[PDB]
Symmetry: C2
Subunit: 444 residues, 2 copies
């Protein structure tokens, strides 16, 4: 096939001008959506705080309007999911992945409103889930919606505009352009065959989405962690050890979410009413903890800069980890609309910090800073559970700007994803998509 | 399909431990090889420096030993390639690219010594090329070599190990473990069909390689620009324009490299003696410039911090740019073993800084620092001419550490690779592999 290949080599990277322009508008819309979605979740969390202030005197009345305000919003978002769009529950990524394999449809007329408002419920209620799950599926569907509207044919166009929607959706959500594109290239694209996802085009999307999100969000980082210390060559072996630990806990965490998915299904059976109720119960639990033990509830992004700095006791670090493992499974395995990425960063930071703590004690000759180990571990549950190491390392890189830690960051990431493989564990998004295609056929 | 997919997902990312262990050894070797190659090159550049000391009074005698030390050294490299391994001349990336498409062979018994020692000559003599191309090909062949020795069977094994070796080679030669991984992904892998290159296995090759080279080079980095300004949003449109300039130039530079590749081939007919004698003239020209005007010769990394910090006049930059467009085509088109990345980087740093100086005067209200454009322009030629803009950006990121410039660097990159496409340029390393498959059937 030497003569075919010469022909192809000379025709490389010539994405059709129509697809390039369309990628641009998909970016621009996904950014604005992501911005709105963001401004919305904040406002509801904020109203919810102004409620506690009006009743800050009667403590049992306080604990009650904390629970109920998160209960109502939870339910309202659960309900929007089972009633108009059941594939818009959960993360949002197994589906956009499914869509790229041509095995799940992009019902953009239903998913845009459902995921957006159903999300504003669970996240704005203060449940332990992140903003990214939402924006990525939302972005994919928006990519689908401009396909249909401008009626563009091709496999390229369908896959491309789908992919640049999800990528631009991860990008705006995290202020992480590189991470978004790498998330397509390493995790989202169809994994067992060739495809025509123009990468130049996914880029144009990401650019515009990131610009838009910046127009409404300059001067404040999601995570300010400042410049930490370096890591010397004799210190690397410690990161490898931390990596191994994530590698065995990775797959173990993956099993719990999947099993808690089943176990929580037996509570409702499929019944919209039991389910919506169980939703507002969970949500109320979270909105409650959001007052009495805030580190155990919410997106997790808050306690990252703290844990890194070393302002937690080892008791707090252990407490937080256990408590947040519990509430992360509850909110995520339930089926509430919302992502698992952002709480897996928190879970990794906490665990890494606790390891930095013991690393400092045992080795004063190393001159450690527990903070360097938190940064190492932030992207490690992303490595050991969803098995997208290249994506998390660049994600963490962009959010924390600590490049001098690139070596231990990679090292911990590899060890995590090598021990996750070796102990028989599967990528979370891929092993969830699978159980979903296995039900879409079992009923036959 | 749905039956097949469900079963494939359940069996994703299970790279066989055999391939994973051998990856670890490939990177380790390529690191060392790269460390060695690098220490070699500088050593020879030092002897040429000390040799200029013993004759630092007789000026025309000085110019001669400059020319001659480099002329001889250059010829050794041209000779070692024409005699023992011809596919080891030039950058060597097209060759490894071909190899992954199973259209070129990996003759490691011939290329390791030829590229290593022949590289030592062209580079050590002080020609306008870089250590990178050499380290990538060397790395690929090392990857091929352990495959044979350990008799690993399979297509996944042949494609993966040859790939992790190529990434490890960029990683070490640039101190850029991410750029190395992104390179295989965005460019080097078979671009038009599915392959079983294990990304996790490439990663392992890059860590071990990058660690090896750290052990022999830490506390010091190739480029240190400092920490520059941020880029206001009302300032981004300038970065779109720069990319456009780089986008129309990219292809024009691409013709010339291809074109002069040809014109030099007329000079020597293909004859090992005229060819080697040409290489010594070009090589001699490069050790000569290396004394009269260093910035027009050598890798180009030295003038990078000097360009970014605005320590050059606009005239001096105009000069450096044109002089280096000449000495780059001459060294690279001629066939000399050595990469074109590094000399392109410095081209971009200089083009940017020039654009950055015109901006500071037109728009004093943007409080601009011309250094910012140098950083956005640096990997822009990489974007336009070789068309790997993701790789270009992540590399410049890993070398300059100015992450707050990510948006202008992405804007220039896309502005480059878009206008390169719209003006009918092509991926150079794919344009080269193309012409080479053409002769290989005529």
């Amino acid at each position: 096939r030497r003569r075919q290949l010469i022909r192809q080599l000379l025709e490389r990277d010539k994405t059709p001008l129509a697809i390039l322009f369309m990628a641009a508008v998909v970016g621009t819309l996904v950014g604005l959506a992501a911005v709105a979605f963001d401004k919305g979740v904040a406002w509801l969390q904020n109203q919810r705080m102004g409620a506690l202030v009006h009743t800050a005197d009667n403590y049992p009345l306080l604990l009650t309007v904390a629970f109920l305000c998160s209960a109502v919003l939870a339910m309202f978002g659960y309900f929007l999911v089972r009633k108009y769009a059941p594939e818009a529950g959960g993360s949002g990524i197994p589906e956009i992945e499914g869509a790229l394999e041509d095995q799940r449809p992009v019902r953009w007329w239903r998913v845009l409103p459902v995921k957006f408002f159903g999300g504003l419920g669970t996240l704005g209620g203060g449940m332990v889930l992140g903003r990214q799950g939402p924006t990525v599926q939302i972005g994919g569907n928006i990519g689908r919606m401009v396909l249909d509207i401008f009626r563009l044919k091709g496999d390229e166009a369908r896959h491309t505009l789908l992919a640049t929607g999800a990528a631009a959706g991860l990008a705006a959500a995290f202020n992480a352009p590189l991470a978004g594109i790498l998330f397509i290239i390493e995790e989202m694209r169809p994994q067992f065959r060739y495809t025509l996802i123009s990468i130049k085009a996914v880029f144009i999307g990401v650019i515009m989405s990131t610009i838009m999100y910046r127009i409404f969000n300059h001067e404040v980082a999601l995570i300010d962690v400042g410049k930490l210390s370096d890591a010397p060559l004799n210190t690397l072996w410690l990161y490898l050890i931390l990596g191994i630990i994530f590698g065995i806990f990775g797959p173990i965490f993956n099993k719990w979410v999947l099993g808690m998915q089943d176990l929580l299904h037996r509570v409702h059976g499929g019944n919209i009413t039991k389910w919506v109720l169980m939703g507002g119960a969970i949500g109320g639990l979270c909105g409650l903890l959001g007052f009495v033990a805030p580190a155990t509830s919410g997106g997790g992004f808050n306690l990252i800069p703290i844990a890194t700095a070393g302002n937690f006791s080892m008791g707090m670090l252990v407490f937080i980890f256990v408590a947040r493992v519990i509430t992360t499974l509850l909110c995520f395995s339930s089926g509430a609309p919302g992502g698992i990425f952002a709480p897996m960063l928190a879970l990794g930071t906490v665990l890494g910090t606790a390891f930095g703590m013991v690393a400092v004690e045992l080795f004063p000759q190393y001159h450690l800073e527990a903070g360097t180990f938190a940064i190492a571990g932030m992207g490690a549950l992303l490595a050991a559970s969803i098995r997208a190491p290249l994506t998390g390392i660049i994600l963490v890189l962009e959010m924390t700007d600590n490049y001098q830690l690139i070596l231990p960051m990679i090292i911990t990431g590899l060890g995590a994803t090598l021990l996750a493989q070796f102990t028989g564990g599967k990528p979370l998004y891929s092993a969830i998509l699978a159980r979903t295609l296995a039900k879409q056929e079992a009923e036959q």
